Design a protein around this ligand. Structure first.
Ligand SMILES: ClCCn1ccnc1
Ligand SMILES: ClCCn1ccnc1
Lengths: 300, 237
């Protein structure tokens, strides 16, 4: 079990760690989060009490280094930093553990939620979507735009998701216009899976990462990407059976975790009604259809 | 974006544009079978592609053989229309290619956009005008060439005859839409109006009769009366 030490908490802030969250008061004696499960990526995220503008946060994997959070009063945000001195980091973590100044990652033993949401998410793939090579962790916030959004403006601060566009020469083979537009199997299997992602695990990893950035930061472009990656599969007549079964599991846990009161802004009615009721895969997503109909029957 | 009454003079500017109407591409007669079921029999159709400034009409005849063994014909017809319009653009010299294609039915937007991806600078637009181009098959010389075709064929027409020698393209388009609207509303009476007087003939090289300027005014008034008469008959007014 790993630990992220806070130098201090000088401003009142709601802190998220994965799907959990807690409030810290201004100058409260808070020094970090312990007992973080090894084996998964994690996200530590922030919303300031005096300015809910800019949710922001950091994706990290404790296997890649020792990281900590330090409030920067000039840039006005909790910043993630790597500690290169392992003996110092162990020493700081131990004293704070002894003084009980840390919250414990509150994982219930029965509870596979975080694994189910991050099954295919790898830190190395995050670091290619979020380009800041000098750090082993990745910053994301509510306002960052995607490469695709910028094409339709600072490129260094962009989310480089894979561009999906159904009315593009990449998606449509000359001579197969009707075929490829009505059945996206070519675009899914040849262009995206074989060509760009190499395998379905990488495709699902990006899909899961997009959902998590949408949910945790309200990042609009991330929500667009998540829906586009769902629609691309659902609008293909030929999809490997193992991908359909895995997608149903992925989406089920995403819909289960979504806050009920954010459904209006995180779910696209057109995409979901098309995917569940009109698409080639309308009968392939049994678990997702069941939870959607029981939890969000209005949207449908 | 969409084309409506606010930007109507745009149709007659110097930017090359074409209307595409697909309403006569897939045509059928519906009938009973020996067993008392219902079946369709296709008949030859056509794509109506018109330059409203010049009157140039590219009439692509759609022969019934293109439907043989195909499914979902109403859907396929939109994609075949888009394919043929795309082929038409690629065949035209660069300086003749349109800068905009206006489709009369919104269901043609995606098929045509997808077929024209290679032409990102040609705008594909809908229109809020209700244009009566479905009635093109009421023009006897157009109906004749479509029905006689034994294979796919492109037939080239000027739908304004020689009118642009005497009137503007705005006025010619208004005359055309009035004639077609009348033929759509009451075909028999419209043809009666156009042919009643044997001394005014259709030249071998024309689609419509050789009316003088004053006779066109009379004809246009008779067409407006027909449309109004039929409106009163329809709604009991
Ligand atoms: Cl780990 C060295 C930085 N640090 C973290 C908490 N207090 C100091
Ligand atoms: Cl040749 C009659 C005029 N026209 C029609 C289409 N291209 C030319």
């Amino acid at each position: 079990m790993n630990t992220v030490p806070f130098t201090s908490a000088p401003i009142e802030v709601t802190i998220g760690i994965d799907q959990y969250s807690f409030n810290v008061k201004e100058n409260q004696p808070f020094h970090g989060i312990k007992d973080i499960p090894i084996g998964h990526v994690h996200v530590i995220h922030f919303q300031h009490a005096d300015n809910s503008s800019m949710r922001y946060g950091y994706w990290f994997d404790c296997r890649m280094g020792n990281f900590y959070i330090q409030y920067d009063p000039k840039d006005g945000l909790y910043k993630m930093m790597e500690e290169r001195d392992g003996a110092k980091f162990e020493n700081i973590v131990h004293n704070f553990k002894e003084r009980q100044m840390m919250v414990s990652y509150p994982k219930i033993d029965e509870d596979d939620t975080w694994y189910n949401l991050t099954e295919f998410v790898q830190m190395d793939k995050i670091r290619k979507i979020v380009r800041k090579d000098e750090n082993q962790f990745s910053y994301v916030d509510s306002s960052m735009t995607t490469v695709q959004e910028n094409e339709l403006s600072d490129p260094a601060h962009s989310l480089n998701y894979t561009v999906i566009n159904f009315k593009s020469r990449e998606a449509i083979r000359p001579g197969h216009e009707m075929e490829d537009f009505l059945d996206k199997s070519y675009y899914l299997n040849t262009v995206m899976l074989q060509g760009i992602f190499k395998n379905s695990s990488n495709y699902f990893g990006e899909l899961q990462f997009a959902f998590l950035n949408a949910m945790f930061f309200g990042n609009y472009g991330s929500s667009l990407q998540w829906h586009a990656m769902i629609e691309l599969i659902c609008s293909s007549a030929t999809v490997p059976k193992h991908m359909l079964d895995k997608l149903d599991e992925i989406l089920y846990y995403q819909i289960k975790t979504l806050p009920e009161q954010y459904s209006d802004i995180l779910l696209n009615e057109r995409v979901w009604n098309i995917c569940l009721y009109s698409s080639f895969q309308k009968n392939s997503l049994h678990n997702t259809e069941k939870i959607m109909e029981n939890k969000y029957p209005e949207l449908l | 974006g969409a084309m409506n009454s606010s930007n109507y003079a745009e149709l007659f500017n110097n930017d090359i544009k074409l209307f595409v109407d697909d309403t006569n591409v897939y045509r059928v007669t519906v009938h009973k079978t020996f067993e008392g079921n219902v079946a369709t029999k296709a008949i030859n159709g056509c794509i109506f592609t018109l330059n409203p400034k010049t009157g140039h009409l590219f009439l692509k005849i759609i022969h019934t053989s293109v439907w043989a063994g195909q499914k979902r014909l109403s859907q396929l017809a939109k994609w075949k229309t888009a394919e043929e319009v795309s082929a038409l653009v690629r065949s035209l010299p660069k300086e003749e290619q349109p800068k905009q294609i206006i489709v009369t039915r919104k269901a043609m937007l995606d098929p045509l956009e997808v077929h024209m991806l290679d032409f990102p600078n040609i705008a594909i637009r809908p229109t809020e005008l209700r244009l009566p181009f479905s009635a093109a098959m009421s023009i006897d010389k157009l109906s004749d060439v479509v029905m006689k075709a034994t294979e796919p064929q492109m037939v080239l027409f000027n739908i304004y005859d020689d009118w642009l020698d005497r009137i503007s393209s705005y006025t010619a388009f208004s005359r055309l839409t009035l004639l077609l609207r009348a033929l759509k509303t009451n075909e028999e009476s419209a043809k009666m109006i156009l042919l009643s007087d044997p001394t005014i003939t259709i030249k071998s090289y024309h689609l419509w009769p050789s009316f003088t300027d004053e006779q066109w005014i009379t004809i246009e008034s008779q067409m407006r009366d027909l449309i109004l008469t039929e409106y009163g008959r329809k709604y009991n007014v």
